[PDB]
Amino acid sequence: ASYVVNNENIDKDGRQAYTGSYNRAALKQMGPQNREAFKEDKLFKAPKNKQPIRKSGGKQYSLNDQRTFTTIDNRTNQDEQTTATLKYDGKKAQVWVADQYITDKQAQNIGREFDERIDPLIENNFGEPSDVDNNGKVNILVYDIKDNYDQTGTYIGGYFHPRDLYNVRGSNHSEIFYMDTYPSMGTDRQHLNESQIYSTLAHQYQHMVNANENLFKEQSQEEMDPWLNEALSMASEQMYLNAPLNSRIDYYNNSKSIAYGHSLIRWDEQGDTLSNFSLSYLFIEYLKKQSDNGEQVFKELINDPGDTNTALQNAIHEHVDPNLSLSKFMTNFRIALVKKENSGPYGFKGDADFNNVHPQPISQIPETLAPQGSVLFQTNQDFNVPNDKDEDISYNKVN
Ligand SMILES: [Ca+2]
Ligand SMILES: [Ca+2]
Ligand SMILES: [Ca+2]
Ligand SMILES: [Zn+2]
């Protein structure tokens, strides 16, 4: 038969748990196509020093003014300093340009797409931004984000840092997110296509209003865990595109780290982050199909005042199943990826968007599995679940 093994511990900081002494009664058991399958971004953590910004009502900058911003070199993880020009001063977005290759037209396309589609989309379905500089607008700094693309082929499409909302070192004292030019817009610096990154505007803007709702509007001031913050950003991309994120599915299908038990809830900052993006994306889409209010569950997760696991558990009880615990919903997620049943917990309600999700069976179980790390294997015998496995490990017969 086949088995889905999962560490059911819902604590992302928990131990990697022993899977047991099992019997090799297992069967012995290409290439991510799109370059966009290797597109990352960075969501940085809010500072513990939440010194507020004080101002005394924000008609400082206008078209063609220059402004030097702190940006982040993701090769070395240092602050850098970048001087940009305001090239679009719109209804909500101010688009700053600091890449000589970007034309004024492209800045105007980006700002207009934000003003007309990105902003309403996010405000109505996720949340609304802060206004720490009392200027009614948000900054979009368009420039060549520094990363290891030239050496790896993995590139950073954009980022958001909640430090910009407080008075700390490196803050730009405003609502701002950062958008990459090369190679996000294309691999030819002289023929960049800015429409390539429009869904990334929704991605980064979700991070921004997420930080506002949870750090400014709610009294607990608890950040959402990265894995679910990132999942909600990719829910917003699909909603903007009204199409599945096929590159994240493509990456899922070819990821050896996922096949060997990559964690849904522990963000592998120094390792294969792309596998975290793929798992976070499929999870939020699984929650969408399993919720009776569909995409409307997204704003309830943000609006919930409790921590990340409490919000998910409340959403499951109200919209999915009042008796179902978060930890078993997560196991059902992994089985749903395999079975894709047309109804019930082991599928995506037959949504065609997810029919090309194909988990990869492996020949041997890893010794240990991180919290919500999962693997799939097949058996040539009536294999027996090991008796010395960690109690957090569930073996789930499927076929
Ligand atoms: Ca503002
Ligand atoms: Ca770049
Ligand atoms: Ca909340
Ligand atoms: Zn992100």
Among candidate residues 41, 353, 75, 45, the one with its CA nearest the CA of residue 202:
41
Q: How far is the CA of 313 from the centre of ligand 1 (A)?
A: 33
Buried b (16+ CB within 10 A) or exposed e, 224-242: bbbbbbbbbbbbbbbbbee
Q: How far is the CA of 326 from the centre of ligand 1 (A)?
A: 36
User: Ligand 4 centre from 379 Cα, in Å?
Assistant: 38
Q: What φ, ψ does residue 325 adopt, rounded to 5°?
A: -85, 155
Give the integer Cα–Cα distance in Å for 176 and 115.
15
For residue 92, give the ligand nearest its CA: 1
CA–CA dist 289, 344 (Å, integer): 10
Rounded CA-CA distance 251/76 in Å is 26
**Residue 361 to residue 364: CA distance in whole angstroms:** 9
| Burial readout 352-364 (b: 16 or more C-beta within 10 A, e: otherwise) | eebeebebebbee
For β-strands 93-97 and 2-7, DSSP reports them as unpaired
CA of 39 to the centre of ligand 1 (A): 28
CA of 310 to the centre of ligand 4 (A): 21
- C-alpha 221 – ligand 3 centre gap (Å): 8
| Elucidation method | X-ray
Please say whether the beta carbons of 210 and 222 come within 8 A: no
- The answer to whether 191 and 213 are in contact (CB under 8 A) is no
Tell me the ligand closest to 201's alpha carbon.
Answer: 4
Expressed in angstroms and rounded, the spacing between residue 17 Cα and the centre of ligand 3 is 30
Residue 377 corresponds to which tokens in the numbers above?
């294997």
- The one-letter amino acid code at 398 reads V
* For the CA of 186, the nearest ligand: 2
The token pair that represents 169 in the structure block = 């070192």
Ligand number with the minimum distance to the CA of 211: 3
Looking at the CA of 94, name the nearest ligand: 1
Q: Write out the DSSP string of 270-336.
A: SS-HHHHHHHHHHHHHHHHHHSTTGGGHHHHHHH--S-HHHHHHHHHHHHT-TT--HHHHHHHHHHH
Q: What does residue 187 show for φ and ψ, rounded to 5 degrees?
A: -90, 5
The structure tokens listed for 391 are 């109690």
CA of 100 from ligand 2 middle (Å) equals: 13
Distance, in Å, from the CA atom of 185 to the CA atom of 207, rounded to the nearest integer, reads 21
Relative to the alpha carbon of 143, which ligand is closest?
Answer: 2
Q: How many CB atoms lie within 10 A of CB 181?
A: 22
CA pair distance 36, 271, nearest whole angstrom: 18
DSSP output for 315-330? HHHHHT-TT--HHHHH
| Nearest residue to 268 (alpha-carbon basis) of 279, 259, 252 | 279
CB 343 within 8 A of CB 349: yes
Residue 143 backbone zone (phi > 0: left; psi -120 to 50: alpha; other: beta): beta
Cα 143 to ligand 2 centroid, rounded to whole Å: 8
Ion ligand 3 neighbours (CB, 5 A) are 214, 304
Going by C-alpha positions, the residue among 221, 375, 188 that lies closest to residue 307 is 221
Spell out where 131-181 has E strands. 138-143, 155-160, 176-180
How far is 320 from 323, CA to CA, in rounded Å?
9
CA distance 60 to 158: 25
Amino acid in the structure at residue 215: L
CA proximity to 315, closest of 394, 203, 232: 232
Strand pairing partners for 70? 81
Strands 138-143 and 176-180: parallel
Ligand nearest to the CA of 180: 2
